[PDB]
Amino acid sequence: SSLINHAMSGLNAAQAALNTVSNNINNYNVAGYTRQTTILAQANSTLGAG
């Protein structure tokens, strides 16, 4: 449930970040390629839980 949802969504973010770093470090030498960084953010935390 929500705890597993936390576990996984963070896994999604980690995978995305790894993809980004691999992308950049591989593309590193190409003329015209600018470094790129991937950013994180919190969910639509909204309340009905007390």
Add this chain to the structure above:
Amino acid sequence: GKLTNGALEASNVDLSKELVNMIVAQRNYQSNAQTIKTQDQILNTLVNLR
């Protein structure tokens, strides 16, 4: 309130609540069943009165 795009609401069941509520319901059920056994005790004692 606001709406989300690409996110959804988790149904409001923390399974633990309903699991332990199941043991509790089974409990009340069994207790009341025991009371019915006592009803049969009383009534068969009435049978024994004859």
